[PDB]
Structures are given as structure tokens and as C-alpha cells.
Design a protein around this nucleic acid. Structure first.
Ligand code: MG
Ligand code: MG
Ligand code: MG
Ligand code: MG
Ligand code: MG
Ligand code: MG
Ligand code: MG
Ligand code: MG
Lengths: 95, 44, 55, 120, 50, 106, 51, 354, 122
RNA sequence: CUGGUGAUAGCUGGUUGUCCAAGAUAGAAUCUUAGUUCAACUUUAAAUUUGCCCACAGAACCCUCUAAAUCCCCUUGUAAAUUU
RNA sequence: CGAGCAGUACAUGCUAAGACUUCACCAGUCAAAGCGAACACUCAAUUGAUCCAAUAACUUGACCAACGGAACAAGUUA
């Protein structure tokens, strides 16, 4: 990670995180399952069902990905007809 | 469970499993039934 | 590690384009299965078209 | 909507029912019972009672078994029990006397398969 | 040996202390000592131990 | 030289524990605990609660299914009068299926 | 023992429950202290001098 | 550590010395019959019956019915034996029995069934419905006197009420035809109560019909203590059960306190408790007959609430408990995207301050 | 392996010869204990250290009063080798509201309600 | 020799006032075992309500039998525990 | 002492409560209800991430066996 760039002097973003993960504005990170396109002929339908689904990262992984991306990726966006629009805010969450 | 009073309640192996002829009982007897009729030997 | 079986692709005869991969013996004629097609929501005939890989 | 006692997968018979038709055929008598899941017996029909014994040449033949079902089917309708399960062994199912007992219950208006529980 | 145990004037015995865990003695004892009652130490037997 | 680790299989919910529908009760290599009332069994002999309630462990008479040849061949060779017992785990439901509530006065 | 297991049961439930509520009250009453305007002004006395 | 058993072991009586010369089961049915016998016996360990079996009081339940009839077994047995030999003597019956073509007349079988063992089956069936549990708080009685109750539907058909059969309120709109065997000079008391028909008090019951001091079988000549009221089970309230009670009176009784005006369309007066009513009349009255049926809601119930009862019809609905979800956590690890939908109330988009 | 110790129930059963040596009465058991720690929790298992804290016996040679009930006795039977147990004696009875400031626990286990610090005139 | 160059070093050595407080031994992966990452443990802040101790009851048959015990755990003694 | 399979299916379809988890993560496992059909396959292990490549899509590709895998590199020094 480049904490200070050589031309602007500002923190850079690791593009390997942007192409793999999605950040909900609430703070959650959404990823894919490792191996959902590999060797599907030898996997049971139950196994493939939980492979082609989107999951959330844990506390440590979410903290790691926040340090590897700048504030441009943590802002609130208002994309028109966004599939994940309703997931950007938590509901009835305590502590 | 071993410490419980009901230990070993499920045991079944001793129920199922767990020649020499003595002077009082004959060891093995072979009974031969010779007859010209096949049905008579099978029936007897 | 001799390849007894091969992986083949069954293409639906309903024209919907739905296809699935199944494993069949190498020394065997082309399969013609009766598999469920989600597009027409019923079981339709399928035909082997191309061998994918040798298992 | 009442829950059935699901489970007991490794043992026989099952308990996922509300009412069960249990047929007891002894050396001399033949008895059929309709009992609830909790063990309580709803209605009964046996060859030991004088009502059915006085009209049977033999209480241990197929005719006696078929006659019990015809008598029990009338009692099932009166009792309000219309659905019940039958859980025979593979040899009992293949037997001729149980086949006609099932026919008597079906012709009497009793269905030998309970409707599925409603969960939603 | 049975006579010695009965007429022993010592009020303290290995069996009583070991079983009741008096003084926390089980911390330096062994699980086998609960049955050996102090008469055995390794491969050696002590006939004089009551 | 083969290296392996424990499978962490055993009792997940003990006697008297409150469970919900779908909670796994026990994972077994072989049928150490048999499914009882309102207890299902998975592919890997995994016991899960089919209803929400209290888990109970009891000893019940083991009557195998007639189709199971190995188990039927075992009871037929038992001495007359012998009865097999095995440990069954049951879930005693705590809540009713539902209640009738007034919704309108028409 | 003075009492058996059955007699002892529930003989101290009220006091134990009340004792824990004190722990809950003390734990859930944690808050920053009050800030007084008198304390801010009392620092001006450091330059207090005679005439 | 080991603990000795608190009772005899299941297979303790079996001797292992001569295991080879011991009779086996050799069959699944022989083991199953023996297996069920021990499953119904008490055990010192935990069992299925302990947790799921219906708890009952160790005290024996009392019997408050008529005394059993006195029948000479020796004469009864001899007459039954003689009929069997005559039936088996005929060669036509044996030929029909061997050909599996003979059959019994079902109408004649029930005629003998209702006289010999019919009352005992009714008591067992009534206990299953828990009528004795609610009406008499567990007190039981044998319905020695059969009761025939049927509703006149149209002009040619009848709807009999035997024990718990389904009857619609439209068919039960009028007073049923009540017939039963009785001797002259005897006094009877008919009673119809709806245990589940009550709308406010679960324990209390609604009264539908009450006739007292009926001379013999002439039900019409009996006093009309309470006018007949059709069952009114609320819509969506399930299945209600109404019980017909036939009482035998030893001396004439005055039911002025239990009398109700004609008509009686007030549910406060229609409230009726069989346990308390029988408690003060048990000295001069003993139950003799029993009949009941199951009732659902139909269109005729709407007429009862609006026109007869002069009220709005209550509508019930079977409500299930809300689905259980664990406490929501800030970071749900390895949870699908649909995790957030489980804890979301509104399905429509939200915008907050914007 | 060293594990927790299960004391047999037979040990805690007073014999007839014990009542004539300690002066206890099985028919009238004492209501309260006087537990005093006389041994260090150091070099003892952690579960024995925890029970000492639960009984309020952090400081040694500091008498503490506990109720003679099975649940409390259960904890005492675990650390019975680290404590001294004596019954609480009340020759003058329970302290009153006017005697709270005049009580004194003697080494004999008696809790007197009149502590005058004056020689007996008798 | 100068410059890149303050090359790099998972290695060695060093790391400068006072006082108080909490505070030690499960593991996994790794061109890895002189290292690092995660977990566990530890610290601080916050929030919440149970935490520990534990009465019965309960936890498998086998290859024939056999240990100290452990898990679970209301009371009770206690004041912690969980979560952010 | 084994495993790097094979066999039977072709709804071995689609969806979805609650949980297990090889002490982390990755990965792995079970599953009621529901739609749609019929009237969560056997098997202790029987397996390989990302990038990339091929393809209209579907999907497939490593004794990457040094099996959490570097796209491709030996010997020797007295
Ligand atoms: Mg340097
Ligand atoms: Mg290193
Ligand atoms: Mg310190
Ligand atoms: Mg884990
Ligand atoms: Mg490597
Ligand atoms: Mg490796
Ligand atoms: Mg690994
Ligand atoms: Mg040289």
C-alpha cells in the first residue's frame, strides 16, 4: 500500500480490492465465493447453491479493506436502479 | 453413559454370539435314507 | 490414471439453448437424456453435442 | 395445522400421523384399531364381540378381516374420523386379507392417507 | 496384615487421607494410589505399610 | 505416514437445552444417538431439531424397519424375550402451532 | 447442614436479584462528568496581584 | 466411575450359559409384538411416555353412570355356542367362507353392537374428545341408555348424531328428533351444551337446549326450560363440539333457577356450566345417555348473529407465532446478502433525510 | 493427570464417637459457620483460588460468617484443606439494633453482645 | 575513486525524565519454523445483562471388561461476563 | 494401512428459516418450509484458490502432488 504517493503525496487505493469486493455504505463488504466457476461438474447442487451467492466479510477483513481503499469508495452513491441500493443502511440494529 | 446407572442398556452383542462326543451324549449323527422312490426319502 | 469416463455437454432439443454437462463412459454411444429444462419448465430431450474433457 | 410427530427415521413404524389404523390378527381373532398419535384408541372393531362373531363362519379367515373393515368404516364415519394412515409390513401389504380390509375402508369413505400438515 | 490394620494405634492412615483429599494431598499423589493405599510404589511392594 | 485432525463431532445441545427449528443437536460418524420425536437426520447422520423446544434424551425400544436386512437379521437371532434398547433424542415443543385472534366484527 | 436442598431453594432469590441490579445500575450510569462554568473562570486568578 | 442400576436390567433374565439351545425369535413380527409389550410398561429410566405421554392423576377416576346390567354368563355362553355350531353346520356358509364371497349385514351388526358393547366404546370415544375432562372435570360415566338424535333436513332426509360426526348449523336449524328406549313413569332430562362455542370465557359453555321432567320417550311433553338455539361457531374459530346429555331422574326436580325466558337471545343467560349444574342435582339425577357432534361455520351462522343474537359476527383468524431470527450482528460473517432482509420491516425504498 | 477431587459422601457423616469429641449436636445443627483461611492459595489449583474469592476469604486469619446450607457447604468441601470451620455460638442471642456497636467475636466462636473490657466482678 | 546511496539486511548492537496502574504459554497457514498474517491471550473506551461457582436429570454401542475425571448444569456463594 | 476412484441417477431442479465447522481466514457440512415435480444418491479419503486461457452463452482447463499453489531458474567452491 502506498500511504503517500510520489506525485500527489496522498494515499492510493489498491485496485485488487475494487475488482473483487463491494462496500455497502453501512460498512459491510460483499464478496463472492472462491471457486464458484471452477469444477462445477464434481459439486453437488447444494454445494453450488452456496457458491453462487454473495456473502459478507467479517470484522477483521472489513477493517483491512477499509485501509486499502480511499474515501472515494466509502462515499454514498445514488445510482439509478441499483441492485444493492436497499442494502446500504442497517435496520433495527442494536449495539 | 458409563457413570450412569443405565450403562450398558443397549448391549446386544452378548445376546447373539457371546465336534467332540462325550461319554453321555453322542457328538454328531448322520441319518441316511435310501429308497427307490424320490418322494418317500424327501418326505421322511 | 486411465481416462475411463469423459465429460460431455447435453443440449436441449427444445431450442431454448439450455444445456448442462454430464459424465458418461468414453466407450459408449451418444446419450439422449430426458432432463428438466427451466426455460420451458418441463422435461425435454437432450442430445450430446461436444465432449468437454476426459475425466 | 396440528404438528405431526416427525422423526423416528431409523425405527418402525413412523409417528408422523394424527390417526393410525392398526390391525391385530391373532391365532383365533382379528382386531382392527384406530388410535391417536398420543396412544389413545378412538374406535375399535374385533371378532371377539358377539355382534361380529355371530355372523362369521370363522373369525380368522379373509372374510372375517374384510368384515371388520366394513364394520369399522361405519364406526369411523360416525366417530368423525375420516383420515388415517396404514403402516403394514411388506408381507402384510402383500397379504390378501389386508388388501380387502383396505378396500373395505376405502369403499366405506375412509381415506388411508392423511392430508399434509399446513405450515404457512 | 489384617491384624495390623485393626490394632494400629495411629489414627491417621494413607487410605483415609488420600480418599478425603486431606491437606490437598492428591496434588502429590497418583490416581492409582487411591486403590494401592500406599502399599505400592512403582514396582515395589511394602508389606509393612498398613 | 498419514496426518489427520479431529472432526469436532459430538453433542451440540445437551439435556434440557432450548433449541430452535434447524438447530443441529449432534453430529456422528455412526448412529450413536437416534432421532426421536421432532428430530430429523441428515445425510451424515446429523441430528437437527425439527421444532422449537427442549431437548430430551431417553431410552426407547429399538424396532428396525423391515427393509433393513442387516438389522432385521439381528433381531431374528436374538433369544426369545430379549428387547433392544437405544438412546433417542427428542425435542419437546414449547410453543403452540398458533392461536385464534379476533380480526374483525362484521 | 441446617437445611436440606429443597428447603434452601429460592431462600435468597430476592436479595441476589436486588444485588445484581446495583451492578447494572452502576455499570449503566457511566457518563462524562458535568462541566461547570465556575471552574473555567477560576483559572483567571493565576494573574491575580496586589495593587 | 460406575453406578449400579436402580432397577432390573432389560435383558438380565437371559442366561448366557446355554445360549445355543435357547428359542430365538426367527421373525420380525414376533419381536415386534414383544417389543411393544415392554414399551408400554413402567421403567426407572427416562422414557418417551415420561415427557410426551399425557399426564394423568394416579387416583382412579370415578364412575357416575347407571349400574351395569346383571347377565348370567353361563346361560349367555351356552346360547352363543349353540348358534355357532348351527352356522358352521351349513355347507353353503362354509363354501361361501372358503370362496371369500360371504359377507355380514352391517345393519344387523350395529343393532347388537349398540346393545352389548356400544356404551363402552362411546365412553372411550368421549374420553378421547375430553368431554369428561371438561364437562365433569374428569368424572366418567357409561352411557347405558342409547340416545338417538337426528335433525329433520327437508321432508325426507335425516342427519343422525352418533358421536362427534360433522353437522352443519344449516342442518341443525330446527329442534332435532329425539328418541330413546325408556320405561313408563320414568323422568328424564335432555341437555345440549356447546363446550367450545363460548366467546368470552374459555371454561364456560353456552346452553342450546334444556328439557326437564320428560315423561318416557315423549320429548314434546317435557318441560321447555330453555328454547332451542342453533349452534353459532364463529368463522375462523375452528371446529366446535356440542354434546347431547340424556339424564335419568329419580324424583321430580324444580328447575326454576335454571329456567330462562322464551326466547333467550342473551349470551349472559345462555352461559351454562355442566359441572356446577350437575353438582347440585346429582342427588336426584344420574347421567344415562350421551351424544355429541362436531360443528363448523356456514352461512346460517351469519343469520344467527345478526337476526337472532342481534350482534356483529366476530371473525377469527389462525395466527402463527412470528419466525425466530437470532440477534442481529454488525458484521455477519459468511452470511448471504438476504441476511439484511430478515431484519428489514418495510420492503419499500427508504431515503432518510434526503 | 491431576484433576478435581470428588470427596465421597461417606466422609461427611459424623459417627457417634465424633459427637462426644467435638461437642456437636446432630439433632440441633448450628445455623452459621465461622470460616477462616489458614493456608495460602498459592501452589493450589485455580478452581480452589476462585472459591476462596467467592467465600470472601482473601485475607488470611480473618473470620467470615457463612450459612450452614448445602450449597455453601459444597464450596467448603472443595477448599476444606485451606480453611478452619467453627460453628457460631450465641450465648446471649442474636445482636439487636442497640447492640450492633457492642459485639465482639471471641476466639472460642462465641459472639457476645456486651463488650465492656472490664474485669469480672465475680 | 566518485556517484546512484541515508543501497539492502526476517541478522547483531543500541534506543536518553519522574510516578502509578492493568498485564505470560490454545492454534492455523507460510520458499515457513531467527520471520510474518490470523486466531487465542492481553490493554483502553463504550454499551448491555447476566457471568463464574454449580442439585438432580442427561451424554454408545463395540474387541469381553476396566481410571482420575470431563461436558451440561437450577439453587447458592459471588461480581463479573458478553457485545461495540 | 489406505485415497488422487467408480457406480447408480438425469427435478444429481429452482429457492429459503435455523445451525455445524478440523481450533484464524479460505474452504467445507446439514437443513424445515415454499414453488415445481414425483407417488439434498451410494461411498472414511476419492481432491487445487486467484490471475489467466477458450467459449455466443453455459461451462471447462494444473502428479500447480513442494497438494494455501512464485507464469518460467541446476551443480559447485578446500
Ligand atoms: Mg539499515
Ligand atoms: Mg528469519
Ligand atoms: Mg501491577
Ligand atoms: Mg471456528
Ligand atoms: Mg510450497
Ligand atoms: Mg504448503
Ligand atoms: Mg489445511
Ligand atoms: Mg586444492
Amino acid at each position: 500500500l502506498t500511504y503517500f504517493s510520489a506525485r500527489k503525496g496522498k494515499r492510493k487505493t489498491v485496485k485488487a480490492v475494487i475488482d473483487r469486493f463491494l462496500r455497502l455504505h453501512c460498512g459491510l463488504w460483499v464478496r463472492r465465493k472462491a471457486g464458484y466457476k471452477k469444477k462445477l461438474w464434481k459439486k453437488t447442487p447444494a454445494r453450488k447453491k452456496r457458491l453462487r451467492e454473495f456473502v459478507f466479510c467479517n470484522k477483521t477483513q472489513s477493517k483491512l479493506l477499509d485501509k486499502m481503499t480511499t474515501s472515494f469508495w466509502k462515499r454514498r452513491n445514488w445510482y439509478v436502479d441499483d441492485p444493492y441500493q436497499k442494502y446500504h443502511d442497517r435496520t433495527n440494529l442494536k449495539v | 453413559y458409563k457413570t450412569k446407572p443405565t450403562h450398558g442398556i443397549g448391549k446386544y452383542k452378548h445376546l447373539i454370539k457371546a465336534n467332540l462326543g462325550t461319554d453321555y451324549e453322542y457328538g454328531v449323527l448322520n441319518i441316511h435314507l435310501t429308497a427307490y422312490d424320490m418322494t418317500l426319502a424327501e418326505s421322511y | 490414471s486411465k481416462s475411463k469416463n469423459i465429460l460431455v455437454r447435453m443440449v436441449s432439443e427444445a431450442g431454448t439453448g439450455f444445456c448442462f454437462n454430464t459424465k458418461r463412459n468414453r466407450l459408449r454411444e451418444k446419450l439422449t437424456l430426458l432432463h428438466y429444462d427451466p426455460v420451458v419448465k418441463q422435461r425435454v430431450l437432450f442430445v450430446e453435442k461436444k465432449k468437454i474433457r476426459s475425466l | 395445522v396440528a404438528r405431526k410427530e416427525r422423526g423416528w427415521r431409523t425405527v418402525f413404524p413412523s409417528r408422523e400421523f394424527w390417526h393410525r389404523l392398526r390391525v391385530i390378527r391373532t391365532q383365533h381373532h382379528v382386531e382392527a384399531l384406530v388410535e391417536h398419535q398420543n396412544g389413545k384408541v378412538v374406535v375399535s372393531a374385533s371378532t371377539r364381540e358377539w355382534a361380529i362373531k355371530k355372523h362369521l363362519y370363522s373369525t380368522r379367515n379373509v372374510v372375517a378381516c374384510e368384515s371388520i373393515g366394513r364394520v369399522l368404516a361405519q364406526r369411523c364415519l360416525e366417530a368423525g374420523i375420516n383420515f388415517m394412515v396404514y403402516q403394514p409390513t411388506p408381507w402384510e401389504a402383500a397379504s390378501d386379507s389386508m388388501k380387502r380390509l383396505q378396500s373395505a375402508m376405502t369403499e366405506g369413505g375412509v381415506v388411508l392417507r392423511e392430508p399434509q400438515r399446513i405450515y404457512e | 496384615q489384617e491384624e495390623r490394620e485393626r490394632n494400629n494405634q495411629n489414627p491417621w492412615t494413607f487410605e483415609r487421607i488420600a480418599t478425603a483429599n486431606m491437606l490437598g494431598i492428591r496434588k502429590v499423589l497418583s490416581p492409582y494410589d487411591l486403590t494401592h493405599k500406599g502399599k505400592y510404589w512403582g514396582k515395589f511392594y511394602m508389606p509393612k505399610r498398613v | 505416514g498419514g496426518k489427520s485432525s479431529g472432526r469436532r463431532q459430538g453433542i451440540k445441545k445437551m439435556e434440557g437445552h432450548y433449541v430452535h427449528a434447524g438447530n443441529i443437536i449432534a453430529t456422528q460418524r455412526h448412529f450413536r444417538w437416534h432421532p426421536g420425536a421432532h428430530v430429523g437426520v441428515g445425510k451424515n447422520k446429523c441430528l437437527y431439531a425439527l421444532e422449537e423446544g427442549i431437548v430430551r434424551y431417553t431410552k426407547e425400544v429399538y424396532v428396525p424397519h423391515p427393509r433393513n436386512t442387516e438389522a432385521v437379521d439381528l433381531i431374528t437371532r436374538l433369544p426369545k424375550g430379549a428387547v433392544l434398547y437405544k438412546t433417542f433424542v427428542h425435542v419437546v415443543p414449547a410453543k403452540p402451532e398458533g392461536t385464534f385472534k379476533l380480526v374483525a366484527m362484521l | 447442614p441446617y437445611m436440606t436442598r429443597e428447603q434452601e431453594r429460592g431462600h435468597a432469590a430476592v436479595r441476589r436479584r436486588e444485588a445484581f441490579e446495583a451492578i447494572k445500575a452502576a455499570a449503566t450510569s457511566k457518563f462524562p462528568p458535568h462541566r461547570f462554568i465556575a471552574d473555567q473562570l477560576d483559572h483567571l486568578n493565576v494573574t491575580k496581584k496586589w495593587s | 466411575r460406575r453406578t449400579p442400576p436402580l432397577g432390573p436390567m432389560p435383558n438380565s433374565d437371559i442366561d448366557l450359559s446355554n445360549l445355543e439351545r435357547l428359542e430365538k425369535y426367527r421373525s420380525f413380527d414376533r419381536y415386534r409384538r414383544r417389543a411393544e409389550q415392554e414399551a408400554q410398561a413402567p421403567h426407572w429410566w427416562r422414557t418417551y411416555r415420561e415427557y410426551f405421554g399425557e399426564k394423568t392423576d394416579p387416583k382412579e377416576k370415578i364412575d357416575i353412570g347407571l349400574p351395569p346390567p346383571k347377565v348370567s354368563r353361563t346361560q349367555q355362553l351356552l346360547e352363543r355356542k349353540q348358534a355357532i355350531q348351527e352356522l358352521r353346520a351349513n355347507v353353503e356358509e362354509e363354501r361361501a367362507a372358503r370362496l371369500r364371497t360371504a359377507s355380514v349385514p352391517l345393519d344387523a351388526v350395529r343393532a347388537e353392537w349398540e346393545r352389548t358393547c356400544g356404551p363402552y366404546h362411546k365412553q372411550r370415544l368421549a374420553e378421547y374428545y375430553g368431554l369428561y375432562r371438561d364437562l365433569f372435570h374428569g368424572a366418567t360415566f357409561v352411557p347405558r341408555v342409547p340416545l338417538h338424535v337426528a335433525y329433520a333436513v327437508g321432508e325426507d332426509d335425516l342427519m343422525p348424531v352418533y358421536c362427534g360426526n360433522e353437522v352443519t348449523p344449516t342442518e341443525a336449524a330446527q329442534a332435532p328428533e329425539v328418541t330413546y328406549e325408556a320405561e313408563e313413569g320414568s323422568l328424564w332430562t335432555l341437555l345440549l351444551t356447546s363446550l367450545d362455542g363460548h366467546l368470552l370465557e374459555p371454561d364456560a359453555e353456552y346452553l342450546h337446549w334444556l328439557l326437564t321432567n320428560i315423561p318416557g320417550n315423549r320429548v314434546a311433553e317435557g318441560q321447555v326450560t330453555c328454547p332451542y338455539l342453533p349452534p353459532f361457531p364463529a368463522r375462523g374459530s375452528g371446529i366446535h363440539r356440542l354434546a347431547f346429555l340424556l339424564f335419568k331422574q329419580d324424583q321430580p326436580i324444580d328447575f326454576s333457577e335454571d329456567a330462562r325466558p322464551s326466547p333467550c337471545y342473551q349470551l349472559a343467560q345462555r352461559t351454562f356450566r355442566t359441572f356446577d349444574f350437575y353438582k347440585k342435582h346429582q342427588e336426584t339425577m344420574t347421567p344415562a345417555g350421551l351424544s355429541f357432534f362436531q360443528c363448523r361455520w356456514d352461512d346460517s351462522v351469519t343469520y344467527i348473529f345478526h337476526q337472532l343474537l342481534d350482534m356483529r359476527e366476530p371473525v377469527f383468524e389462525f395466527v402463527r407465532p412470528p419466525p425466530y431470527h437470532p440477534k442481529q450482528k454488525r458484521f455477519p460473517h459468511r452470511q448471504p446478502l438476504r441476511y439484511l432482509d430478515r431484519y428489514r420491516d418495510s420492503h419499500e425504498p427508504t431515503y432518510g433525510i434526503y | 493427570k491431576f484433576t478435581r477431587s470428588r470427596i465421597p459422601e461417606k466422609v461427611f457423616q459424623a459417627s457417634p464417637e465424633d459427637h462426644e469429641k467435638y461437642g456437636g449436636d446432630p439433632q440441633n445443627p448450628h445455623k452459621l459457620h465461622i470460616v477462616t483461611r489458614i493456608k495460602s492459595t498459592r501452589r493450589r489449583p485455580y478452581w480452589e483460588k476462585d472459591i476462596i474469592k467467592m467465600l470472601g476469604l482473601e485475607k488470611a486469619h480473618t473470620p467470615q460468617v457463612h450459612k450452614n446450607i448445602p450449597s455453601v457447604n459444597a464450596k467448603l468441601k472443595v477448599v476444606k484443606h485451606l480453611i478452619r470451620i467453627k460453628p457460631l455460638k450465641l450465648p446471649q442471642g442474636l445482636p439487636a439494633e442497640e447492640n450492633m456497636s457492642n459485639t465482639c467475636l471471641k476466639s472460642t466462636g462465641e459472639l457476645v453482645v456486651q463488650w465492656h473490657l472490664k474485669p469480672v466482678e465475680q
